Amino acid sequence: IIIATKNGKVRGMNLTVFGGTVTAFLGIPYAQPPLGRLRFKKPQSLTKWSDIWNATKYANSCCQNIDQSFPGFHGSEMWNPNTDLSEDCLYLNVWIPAPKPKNATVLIWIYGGGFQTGTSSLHVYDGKFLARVERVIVVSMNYRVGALGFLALPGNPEAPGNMGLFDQQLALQWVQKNIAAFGGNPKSVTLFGESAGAASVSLHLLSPGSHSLFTRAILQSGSFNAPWAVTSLYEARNRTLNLAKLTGCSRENETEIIKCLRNKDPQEILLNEAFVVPYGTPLSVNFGPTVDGDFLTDMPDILLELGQFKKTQILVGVNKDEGTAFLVYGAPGFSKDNNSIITRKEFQEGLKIFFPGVSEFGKESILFHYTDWVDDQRPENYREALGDVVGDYNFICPALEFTKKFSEWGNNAFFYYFEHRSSKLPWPEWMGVMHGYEIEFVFGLPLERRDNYTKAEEILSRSIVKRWANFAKYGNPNETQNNSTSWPVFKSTEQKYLTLNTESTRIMTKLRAQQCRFWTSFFPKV
Amino acid sequence: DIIIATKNGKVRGMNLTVFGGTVTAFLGIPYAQPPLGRLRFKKPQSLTKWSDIWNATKYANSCCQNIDQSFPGFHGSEMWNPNTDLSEDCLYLNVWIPAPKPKNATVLIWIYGGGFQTGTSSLHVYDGKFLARVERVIVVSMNYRVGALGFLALPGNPEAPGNMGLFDQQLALQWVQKNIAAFGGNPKSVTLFGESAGAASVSLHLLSPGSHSLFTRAILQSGSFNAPWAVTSLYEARNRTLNLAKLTGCSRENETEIIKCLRNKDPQEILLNEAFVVPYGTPLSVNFGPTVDGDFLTDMPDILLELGQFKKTQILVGVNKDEGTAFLVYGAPGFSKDNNSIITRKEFQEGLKIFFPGVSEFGKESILFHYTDWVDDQRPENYREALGDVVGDYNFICPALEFTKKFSEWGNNAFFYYFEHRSSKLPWPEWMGVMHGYEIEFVFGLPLERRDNYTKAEEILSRSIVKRWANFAKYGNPNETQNNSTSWPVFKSTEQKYLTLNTESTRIMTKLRAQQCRFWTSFFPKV
Numbered sequence A: 001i002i003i004a005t006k007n008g009k010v011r012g013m014n015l016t017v018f019g020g021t022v023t024a025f026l027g028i029p030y031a032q033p034p035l036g037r038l039r040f041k042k043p044q045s046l047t048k049w050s051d052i053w054n055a056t057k058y059a060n061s062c063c064q065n066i067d068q069s070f071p072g073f074h075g076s077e078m079w080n081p082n083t084d085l086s087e088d089c090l091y092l093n094v095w096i097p098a099p100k101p102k103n104a105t106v107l108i109w110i111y112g113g114g115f116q117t118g119t120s121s122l123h124v125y126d127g128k129f130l131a132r133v134e135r136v137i138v139v140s141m142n143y144r145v146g147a148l149g150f151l152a153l154p155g156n157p158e159a160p161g162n163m164g165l166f167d168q169q170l171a172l173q174w175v176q177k178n179i180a181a182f183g184g185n186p187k188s189v190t191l192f193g194e195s196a197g198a199a200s201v202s203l204h205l206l207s208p209g210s211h212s213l214f215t216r217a218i219l220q221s222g223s224f225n226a227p228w229a230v231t232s233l234y235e236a237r238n239r240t241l242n243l244a245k246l247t248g249c250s251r252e253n254e255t256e257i258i259k260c261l262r263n264k265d266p267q268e269i270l271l272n273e274a275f276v277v278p279y280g281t282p283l284s285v286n287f288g289p290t291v292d293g294d295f296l297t298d299m300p301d302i303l304l305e306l307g308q309f310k311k312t313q314i315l316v317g318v319n320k321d322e323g324t325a326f327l328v329y330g331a332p333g334f335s336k337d338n339n340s341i342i343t344r345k346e347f348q349e350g351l352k353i354f355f356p357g358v359s360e361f362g363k364e365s366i367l368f369h370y371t372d373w374v375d376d377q378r379p380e381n382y383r384e385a386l387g388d389v390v391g392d393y394n395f396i397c398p399a400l401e402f403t404k405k406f407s408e409w410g411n412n413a414f415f416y417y418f419e420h421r422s423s424k425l426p427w428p429e430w431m432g433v434m435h436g437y438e439i440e441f442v443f444g445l446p447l448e449r450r451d452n453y454t455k456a457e458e459i460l461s462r463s464i465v466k467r468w469a470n471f472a473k474y475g476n477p478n479e480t481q482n483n484s485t486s487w488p489v490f491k492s493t494e495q496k497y498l499t500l501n502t503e504s505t506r507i508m509t510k511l512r513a514q515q516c517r518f519w520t521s522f523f524p525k526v
Numbered sequence B: 001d002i003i004i005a006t007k008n009g010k011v012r013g014m015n016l017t018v019f020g021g022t023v024t025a026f027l028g029i030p031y032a033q034p035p036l037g038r039l040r041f042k043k044p045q046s047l048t049k050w051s052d053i054w055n056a057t058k059y060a061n062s063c064c065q066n067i068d069q070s071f072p073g074f075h076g077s078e079m080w081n082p083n084t085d086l087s088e089d090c091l092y093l094n095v096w097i098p099a100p101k102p103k104n105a106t107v108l109i110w111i112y113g114g115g116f117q118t119g120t121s122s123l124h125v126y127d128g129k130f131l132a133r134v135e136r137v138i139v140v141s142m143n144y145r146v147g148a149l150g151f152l153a154l155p156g157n158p159e160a161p162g163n164m165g166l167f168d169q170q171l172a173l174q175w176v177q178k179n180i181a182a183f184g185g186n187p188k189s190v191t192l193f194g195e196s197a198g199a200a201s202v203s204l205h206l207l208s209p210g211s212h213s214l215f216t217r218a219i220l221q222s223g224s225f226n227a228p229w230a231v232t233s234l235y236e237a238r239n240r241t242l243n244l245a246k247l248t249g250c251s252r253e254n255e256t257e258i259i260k261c262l263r264n265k266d267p268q269e270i271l272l273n274e275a276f277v278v279p280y281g282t283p284l285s286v287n288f289g290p291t292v293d294g295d296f297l298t299d300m301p302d303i304l305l306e307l308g309q310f311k312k313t314q315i316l317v318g319v320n321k322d323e324g325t326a327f328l329v330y331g332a333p334g335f336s337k338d339n340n341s342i343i344t345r346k347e348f349q350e351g352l353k354i355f356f357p358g359v360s361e362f363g364k365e366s367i368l369f370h371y372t373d374w375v376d377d378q379r380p381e382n383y384r385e386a387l388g389d390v391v392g393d394y395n396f397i398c399p400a401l402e403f404t405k406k407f408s409e410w411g412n413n414a415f416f417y418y419f420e421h422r423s424s425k426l427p428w429p430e431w432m433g434v435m436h437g438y439e440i441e442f443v444f445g446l447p448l449e450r451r452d453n454y455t456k457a458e459e460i461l462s463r464s465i466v467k468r469w470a471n472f473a474k475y476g477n478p479n480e481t482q483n484n485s486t487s488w489p490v491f492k493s494t495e496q497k498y499l500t501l502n503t504e505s506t507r508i509m510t511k512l513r514a515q516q517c518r519f520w521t522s523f524f525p526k527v
């Protein structure tokens, strides 16, 4: 099992999947380790070893903070890294069907984590099932997160910002220069990613450097116009300056700040990232993408409205309860271990927690919009309200607006609304269909019948798996039995979208129009 | 001959022929001493007697007031202008009685509107002879003082205590109690109905102890004391009467000397300065209106309503489809009686600027956001219509609804109506729709007279508003007939059923414009 890469030589393994074989290569180095002198710099292209890389283990995950609010609880720990953490973490993975194809479309996964956490080695990103079932190559990479990936002194080559985005980019260049050795087709590449991964993907639609490096895009629960997705340059270097004073790295010219920060033990970077912004929010992104003048030329929303982006089909969508996940990270009244019925005023306190900088008039205007009950008996009205507020403002409305404004340039867009709750999901039922819990289905996890899903969830996952393959290969997410419902194109006038659950595959119009038309045409005025 | 002996003296009236019958009418019976000279700005003083015979055979004088002059010759505007001479000597009332003369007829008593600044009972659309003829009820109407002559307020000071016009109405109610049995009516079946400021007056009479024994039920058309125009807080009342003193040259420090100074002033200097007493003001500003005087009103009206200190009786309440459109051609930029009045978006908020002069710009943008979730974002009319609705919902509809809910919650049966039919003879343009005040014709049965080019549908619809109003008067239930009319159900605060009125179909519906009123009741007060 040995493949010659354009620079180098890797040994992989035979995984046996569903009766056949997928050959995979785990932890291929795609960049020099960004240590010491290179901490905070753009990833630098590798020199050529030859020897043989045993690409037979997931590589190290990038340095990051780890959520430990619930020790020994699957629902939070399943997003925690599962390989050792090092700054030596710029590696990627490749799953390939067996026997080896000759021009097979490839899907490159980009994980989410609020640009602060995440790794490609998580079980729910296992590429073997895709490769097996749909005969695509799957590739996924580790990029830097947190200040190690996004610390910004705009314009200074060292610390330019967006270094994790350049990590992703360099992996995409690796697939361009090497996937054809693996049997992949470089002219047929589809980015799919979720959360910050999806926002990352949307940012690759705008960066000129990334233009030639893929074909299509799939954006799950994220896009760069999300309020958490982009940091202004003013915010970004207030944040890096406070990181400097928190580490004792306060100097007067930027370069000396930077080398002081480079002779700091990584845990003193990581354990101070939490304090750089004074009014955090459960969704605060401490160090995220900025308009760096390199990766991002100007501010993304105008590049989108001006139309200077790559022109291709995109697939975009959201889950029904995107917001509930974050309500337990400090909204009063809310618990993983009770039903979380709240009053109107626990509601209002929750809104302060998520909208700290908003006038009281503005928080009540929110409440007004989300309190026109259809059934005012319903106890859990306010629960549902607050979750829906967080989810709409942070994910659903930005995704709708993004594909709305993307489609009006002759590009074909498909939008989905995922509404099934995993029968083995470990969070309470009141949280519904949570942020991130379609990924098990996009990666075909429930196809393992030994695994505990329900035949229904298996059929559903097989549907979503082939729709995204077909979108990757063809640019149209058709299902090619034609039992299936056909999925039409989102365009601003009609705005049609497709519903994903086990009961049915309905087709619907103008998703949450009345909620989002607040977040688009009123809130920005408060 | 035609003579009735009243306690104050005997009066003479008129035979009128109505639909091959006769109602007998007594027009312009005095119910009080003329509020002249020393009596200006004070409560109505009781009449004593005359030994002569007072022929009640013409409408009396209307009360001193300013007049609508923006549209000379336009029946739509002038139909509301007073149609008799104007004079402080104006406290007179009218009595329509069916023939043969009734023995215990229930009595409808009408209180007119006009923003407490204008109006009079002698208008053609308040003619009670049809009701008397068709439903066999006595109809009674009265003139009460409007404007500063009616509502000048130095609270506490008998010389001008506030609310004299309301006391005028009340003294007319006392006249009905003391005298109507001589005409054949039942003093213990007496329903007050009124419109606009008249319906506000009716709701206040439900609040006021002194009116409690003077009537039995109440009908409220497009009006209620909780409308934002109906009541002025005590202070603000006294500050306008103060500035009126300042404009006429009546600023004294012994506060009664002010009242003397104005009492020697010529009526039209007072009328002439009444508009200026409020800085700015909307097309709906009530310059001198009801106030918390501590006599007619012992507390802020909304307090009394919450505490349940009001008369426990049955009520009929409703509104019109387009309560607001009238007020747009009176100051909103881009509106006219004569073009279709398609306006732009913030021509729209020059409109809100005009009708909400004291609201923040965040509040006005929120009003706009609430009213611009179009069903058809390519419909030109859309903004025009929105503004009508805004002015309408805020000023009449949502308060009527709110009043009926809270009134309903104390155990009495309320009935709510949505009046939805445009008079074919309506003179205003069609874009104005079912305007404020244009139900009154149908309630008073003018469409029953088959000689004024009304539609047959309109006759039928007037006949049923008439017999429903009369049956509510007599029986507490606005049934038309048991067996092929729609049940008019009670307004209960849970369901909030109401009955719509128009020529095509009467239906029961629920929660009239609940999504708008929600904004007015529970977001706007926080702004």
Ligand SMILES: CCn1c2ccccc2c2cc([C@H]3C(C(=O)OC[C@H]4CCCO4)=C(C)NC4=C3C(=O)CCC4)ccc21
Binding pocket: A067, A079, A112, A113, A114, A115, A116, A117, A118, A194, A195, A196, A228, A282, A283, A284, A285, A286, A325, A326, A329, A434, A435, A436
């Ligand atoms: C910046 C911190 N941050 C975010 C910021 C924006 C959007 C999503 C996340 C996000 C998502 C996660 C994870 C998460 C969650 O529950 O975490 C809560 C956050 C709040 C504070 C620390 O952890 C879910 C439900 N799904 C997913 C998570 C992931 O990290 C992978 C994508 C799916 C973790 C951190 C996260």
Ligand SMILES: CCn1c2ccccc2c2cc([C@H]3C(C(=O)OC[C@H]4CCCO4)=C(C)NC4=C3C(=O)CCC4)ccc21
Binding pocket: B068, B080, B112, B113, B114, B115, B116, B117, B118, B119, B195, B196, B197, B229, B283, B284, B285, B286, B287, B326, B330, B435, B436, B437
């Ligand atoms: C402040 C003066 N004011 C009001 C104030 C609040 C509510 C209604 C009116 C009101 C109603 C009227 C009259 C009117 C109208 O069109 O007048 C416009 C006024 C407003 C400013 C200048 O002229 C209609 C449509 N219907 C009715 C009117 C009345 O006179 C009562 C019967 C119904 C007259 C004066 C009025």
Ligand SMILES: *[C@@H]1O[C@H](CO)[C@@H](O[C@@H]2O[C@H](CO)[C@@H](O)[C@H](O)[C@H]2NC(C)=O)[C@H](O)[C@H]1NC(C)=O
Binding pocket: A331, A332, A333, A334, A335, A337, A338, A339, A340, A341
């Ligand atoms: C759900 O659980 C939470 C957490 O235990 C409860 O809220 C806590 O209540 C205690 C006192 O009773 C406070 O000291 C904590 O600060 C509260 N925590 C939070 C996060 O609010 C809540 O009462 C429970 N709700 C229900 C419906 O059982």
Ligand SMILES: *[C@@H]1O[C@H](CO)[C@@H](O[C@@H]2O[C@H](CO)[C@@H](O)[C@H](O)[C@H]2NC(C)=O)[C@H](O)[C@H]1NC(C)=O
Binding pocket: B103, B104, B186, B188, B189
């Ligand atoms: C006129 O009508 C009233 C009822 O509307 C007649 O009866 C009085 O009604 C009150 C109720 O308010 C009762 O408490 C009295 O006991 C009734 N009186 C009598 C004598 O029965 C009233 O009598 C009628 N009068 C005429 C002349 O018809």
Ligand SMILES: *[C@@H]1O[C@H](CO)[C@@H](O[C@@H]2O[C@H](CO)[C@@H](O)[C@H](O)[C@H]2NC(C)=O)[C@H](O)[C@H]1NC(C)=O
Binding pocket: B471, B475, B477, B479, B480, B481, B482
């Ligand atoms: C409307 O309803 C009333 C009942 O509320 C009908 O009955 C009249 O009122 C009382 C009963 O509450 C009876 O003693 C009267 O005798 C009834 N009226 C007559 C004329 O007999 C009333 O009849 C109904 N109206 C119509 C037009 O059917």
Ligand SMILES: *[C@@H]1O[C@H](CO)[C@@H](O)[C@H](O)[C@H]1NC(C)=O
Binding pocket: A001, A014, A021, A098
């Ligand atoms: C890997 O699998 C292929 C076919 O699945 C087989 O031909 C090959 O011998 C295997 N190699 C190893 C080292 O297991």
Ligand SMILES: *[C@@H]1O[C@H](CO)[C@@H](O)[C@H](O)[C@H]1NC(C)=O
Binding pocket: A102, A103, A185, A187, A188
């Ligand atoms: C790969 O497939 C593409 C079609 O997408 C084709 O243009 C190209 O010639 C193929 N090359 C090889 C080596 O198969």
Ligand SMILES: *[C@@H]1O[C@H](CO)[C@@H](O)[C@H](O)[C@H]1NC(C)=O
Binding pocket: A238, A239, A241, A242, A278
């Ligand atoms: C950074 O932000 C904090 C919070 O707003 C503020 O107090 C501080 O002055 C800002 N600037 C610096 C240099 O820290």
Ligand SMILES: *[C@@H]1O[C@H](CO)[C@@H](O)[C@H](O)[C@H]1NC(C)=O
Binding pocket: A253, A255, A256
């Ligand atoms: C930053 O400060 C050090 C301190 O001496 C100096 O040597 C270096 O040249 C400075 N860099 C500048 C001014 O760009």
Ligand SMILES: *[C@@H]1O[C@H](CO)[C@@H](O)[C@H](O)[C@H]1NC(C)=O
Binding pocket: A470, A474, A476, A478, A479, A480, A481, A482
């Ligand atoms: C999906 O599209 C491809 C090419 O567009 C076609 O070959 C395939 O048959 C289609 N499957 C359907 C329509 O189910």
Ligand SMILES: *[C@@H]1O[C@H](CO)[C@@H](O)[C@H](O)[C@H]1NC(C)=O
Binding pocket: B001, B002, B015, B022, B099, B100
């Ligand atoms: C009034 O009308 C009645 C009929 O209702 C009639 O008998 C009487 O003579 C009339 N009297 C006068 C003075 O018109």
Ligand SMILES: *[C@@H]1O[C@H](CO)[C@@H](O)[C@H](O)[C@H]1NC(C)=O
Binding pocket: B236, B239, B240, B243
């Ligand atoms: C009272 O009227 C005067 C007019 O000069 C004005 O200055 C003052 O603000 C008014 N007060 C109130 C409470 O309206």
Ligand SMILES: *[C@@H]1O[C@H](CO)[C@@H](O)[C@H](O)[C@H]1NC(C)=O
Binding pocket: B334, B335, B336, B339, B340, B341, B342
């Ligand atoms: C309607 O008439 C008024 C008064 O002349 C005018 O100001 C307005 O511009 C006109 N609008 C249209 C659309 O004709």
